[PDB]
Write a protein that binds this ligand. Structure first.
Ligand SMILES: [Ca+2]
Ligand SMILES: [Ca+2]
Ligand SMILES: [Ca+2]
Ligand SMILES: [Ca+2]
Ligand SMILES: [Zn+2]
Length: 316
C-alpha cells in the first residue's frame, strides 16, 4: 500500500524485542520500504489460502502473542536481504529487487515452512515438534535461499540436484545466522525445534550422522522417499561445506579450513555461474573447484581445501 515509512517495535517468537520497518496509512502495515521493492508480511489466519491479508496493526506496537511470528518473519527477511546485498552484491532473490512476501499463521499446527514459487510460508508448529517456524533465522534464510536458487541454478528438486538445492539452503541459512551473530552454530533449526528438548536440532552440518543423515557418499540414500532423499543426502554436502570452512579430519582425510567468508564466496559463485538444473554431486565438486580457482588461483590453499573436503565425503 501507499503510505509513510516508519518504525515500529515488537517481540519475536523467542520473546526478544526488536524494531521493524512498517508503513503508515490509517493502519500500520508490515511493509518495509527500505529494502528493494519492499518486504511484505501477511496474515494467513490459520487458513491455507495465500497470501492472506497484508498485516495491519492499529498502534505500531507488536507485543501480542499472535504478532510474534509476523515480527520475526518480517525482521529476518530483512536481515537475509541485507546479507545478500552487502556480502554478495545481490539485490533480492531475483537480482532485481523483487518484493519479498511472507505469510504466517498458515494452517493449524503446521510443522513446516516453504517457498511456493512466489512467496515464503510459515506454519505455527504444533508446539511439540516446532514452535512458529519464522522464529529461526536459519529457517527464514533457508527458505529465501530456495528462491535465490530458483532464479539462478534452478536445481531440480529431486535426487542429487535436489540434495544440492537443500544443502545450498542450509549453507546460506547458516551463513546468514553467523552474519546476524544470533547465537550462531552449524546446526539447523535449533531455535524452533522441540521446545521441550534443549541442545538438539533438525539437522547438523558439523555432524550429519548425529541425526542419522549420511556424511559420506558411500552412505547415500538411494530410495524414492523424500523426492529421492533431498533432505537426507544434503548431509553429504553440508559436511563438505563445514569442512571447507572449519577444517578437520573426516574418514582419514585431513582438510585445512579456510573460513566462512571464503566458503560463502566459493559457493555463491558456483551457484550463480556454474551449476545447472540437473547438476549432480560430481558436477558440484567441479563447480566449486572452478569457483575457488577463479577467485584464488589454481595453486591456492583454497582450491586445495575444496578438493580435500570433497575427497573426505567421497565425492569424486
Ligand atoms: Ca498493536
Ligand atoms: Ca543458533
Ligand atoms: Ca542454526
Ligand atoms: Ca529443541
Ligand atoms: Zn529446503
Amino acid at each position: 500500500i501507499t503510505g509513510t515509512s516508519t518504525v515500529g517495535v515488537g517481540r519475536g517468537v523467542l520473546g526478544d524485542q526488536k524494531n521493524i520497518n512498517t508503513t503508515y496509512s490509517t493502519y500500520y502495515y508490515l511493509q518495509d520500504n527500505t529494502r528493494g521493492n519492499g518486504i511484505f508480511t501477511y496474515d494467513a489466519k490459520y487458513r491455507t489460502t495465500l497470501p492472506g491479508s497484508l498485516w495491519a496493526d492499529a498502534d505500531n506496537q507488536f507485543f501480542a502473542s499472535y504478532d510474534a511470528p509476523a515480527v520475526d518473519a518480517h525482521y529476518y527477511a530483512g536481515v537475509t536481504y541485507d546479507y545478500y546485498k552487502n556480502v554478495h552484491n545481490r539485490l533480492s532473490y531475483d537480482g532485481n529487487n523483487a518484493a519479498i512476501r511472507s505469510s504466517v499463521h498458515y494452517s493449524q499446527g503446521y510443522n513446516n515452512a516453504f517457498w511456493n514459487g512466489s512467496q515464503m510460508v510459515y506454519g505455527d508448529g504444533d508446539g511439540q515438534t516446532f514452535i512458529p517456524l519464522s522464529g529461526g533465522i536459519d529457517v527464514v534464510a533457508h527458505e529465501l535461499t530456495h528462491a535465490v536458487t530458483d532464479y539462478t541454478a534452478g536445481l531440480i528438486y529431486q535426487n542429487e540436484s535436489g540434495a544440492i538445492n537443500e544443502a545450498i539452503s542450509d549453507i546460506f541459512g547458516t551463513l546468514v545466522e553467523f552474519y546476524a551473530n544470533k547465537n550462531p552454530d552449524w546446526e539447523i533449526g535449533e531455535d524452533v525445534y522441540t521446545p521441550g528438548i534443549s541442545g538438539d536440532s533438525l539437522r547438523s552440518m558439523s555432524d550429519p550422522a548425529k541425526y542419522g543423515d549420511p556424511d559420506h557418499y558411500s552412505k547415500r540414500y538411494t530410495g524414492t522417499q523424500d523426492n529421492g532423499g533431498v533432505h537426507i543426502n544434503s548431509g553429504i554436502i553440508n559436511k563438505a561445506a563445514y569442512l571447507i570452512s572449519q577444517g578437520g579430519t573426516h574418514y582419514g582425510v585431513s582438510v585445512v579450513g579456510i573460513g566462512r567468508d571464503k566458503l560463502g564466496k566459493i559457493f555463491y559463485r558456483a551457484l550463480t555461474q556454474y551449476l545447472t538444473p540437473t547438476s549432480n554431486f560430481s558436477q558440484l565438486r567441479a563447480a566449486a573447484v572452478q569457483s575457488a580457482t577463479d577467485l584464488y588461483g589454481s595453486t591456492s590453499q583454497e582450491v586445495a581445501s575444496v578438493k580435500q573436503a570433497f575427497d573426505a565425503v567421497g565425492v569424486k
